[PDB]
Structure formats: structure tokens, C-alpha cells
Amino acid sequence: SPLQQGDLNALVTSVQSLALNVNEILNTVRNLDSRMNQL
Amino acid sequence: PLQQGDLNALVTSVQSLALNVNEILNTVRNLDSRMNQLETKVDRILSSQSLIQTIKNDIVGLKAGMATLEGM
Amino acid sequence: SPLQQGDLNALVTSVQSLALNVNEILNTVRNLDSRMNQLETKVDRILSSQSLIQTIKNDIVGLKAGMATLEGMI
Amino acid sequence: PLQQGDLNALVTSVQSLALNVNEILNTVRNLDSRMNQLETKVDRILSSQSLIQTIKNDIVGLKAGMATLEGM
């Protein structure tokens, strides 16, 4: 089956969905950094 | 002409990245919970530091009172 | 310019390179998880002794009342 | 036929993922260093807990010795 734009677009949305998980990790580790400083 | 199968390696690499990121997420959520516990327990320790200076003041009185007895 | 296999392959290597950074993060957060567990155990040990302090506070208060008793008896 | 520019959105999305992962890496390396400091300082606190029981034993002697004086 020939590769289609929709196949590339599927990977874009997958990566952008993964990016939301990365964003939660980043927010949480920054919060941990502040809290370990206070500790 | 590129075929759907030509994208397989990229799809698999993103699936693996997502699996490993998910395990980071699981671990950092656990670190967050652990930090709650540590903070509560350190606050408890910090509160008992009031006893130390109370002991401190009383011992000052015990020192003076004992000087009194030694004179007597 | 027509899309080529090499263009897809470039993204594969980019993602696999990113995966090495993800791997360091994962190794480090697991290590932090183990170390925070061990830290909490030590904080537990400190907490248990902090109330041995409360007994000390009581004993010292008792010693003060006694010492006043000695002085009151003259 | 797909063109190079048809991949742009995917390239950009991976660049952004990489930038954010790099900032996680920077932060977790800092958490590792902070944890070293916390561990060393908690070990210091834990070591001084030896003074507490020494105070404990001595106070036991002070209690008995004072009963002696009270007997007089």
C-alpha cells in the first residue's frame, strides 16, 4: 500500500499525545525540585 | 514510491519511546507521593525541636539551683 | 523534492537518539525512588527518637521539682 | 507523490519532544545532586541520635542520685 499523508499525520498525533505525558513529567520534576530545596 | 511498510521502523521507535516515557511517568508519580510522606515526617521532626529549647531553659534553672545547693 | 526513505530514516535515528535521553531519565528516577524510600526509613528512625526527647523533657521537669524540694527542705 | 515538506510537522513535533525531554534531563540531574545533599544531612542528624540516649542514661543516674539526696 502506498504511503499516504494520513500515515505521517498519524505519527504526528502520536508524538503530540506523547508530548502531553512528557509535559506532566516535566511539571512534576520541577515541582519535586522546588520541594526538595524546601526540604 | 514509498510504501506503508517503509514507515514501520519509525512507528516502532515511537511506540518504544512511548512505553519508556510511560514508565517514567509511573515512577515520578510515585516520587511525588513519597515526597508528600517525607515532607509530613520532616515537619513532625521540626515541631519536636520545641522540646529541645524547653529542655534548654529548664537545664539553665537546674544549673543555678544546683549552685545554690552547693553553697548550702 | 520527493520524500525519500532517507528522510524517514533520519527521523528514526532522531527518535532513537532521544530514546537514550529518555533511558537516562528513567534510570535516574528509579534510582531516586529507591533512595527516597531509604531516606524515609532513616527519617522514621529520627522520628522515633524525637519523642525520647519528650520523656527527657518530663524527666528534667521532675528533676526541677525535686531540686526545689531540696531547697525547700533547706 | 509525497514531498519532503509533507514530513515537516512530524520533524517539528519530534524537535519539540526532544527540547522538553532535555529539560526533564536537566531537572532530574539536579534532583540527583539534591538527593546527595539530603542523604548526607539526614545521616548527620541520625548520628547525633547517639547523644539522646547518652542524655537518657545520665538522667537515669541523676534521678537515682537525687533520690539519695532527698533521703537525707
UniProtKB/Swiss-Prot annotation, chain A:
Subunit structure comment from the entry: Homotetramer. Interacts (via multimerization domain) with polymerase L; this interaction forms the polymerase L-P complex. Interacts (via N-terminus) with N0 (via Ncore); this interaction allows P to chaperon N0 to avoid N polymerization before encapsidation. Interacts (via C-terminus) with N-RNA template; this interaction positions the polymerase on the template for both transcription and replication.
Family affiliation: Belongs to the rubulavirus/avulavirus P protein family.
Coiled coil location: 22-39
Entry remark concerning the domains of this protein: The N-terminus consists of a long intrinsically disordered tail. The central part contains the coiled-coil multimerization domain (PMD). Forms a four-stranded coiled coil structure. The C-terminus constitutes the alpha-helical domain that binds to the nucleocapsid (N-RNA complex).
Described purpose of this protein according to its UniProt entry: Essential cofactor of the RNA polymerase L that plays a central role in the transcription and replication by forming the polymerase complex with RNA polymerase L and recruiting L to the genomic N-RNA template for RNA synthesis. Also plays a central role in the encapsidation of nascent RNA chains by forming the encapsidation complex with the nucleocapsid protein N (N-P complex). Acts as a chaperone for newly synthesized free N protein, so-called N0, allowing encapsidation of nascent RNA chains during replication.
Protein name: Phosphoprotein
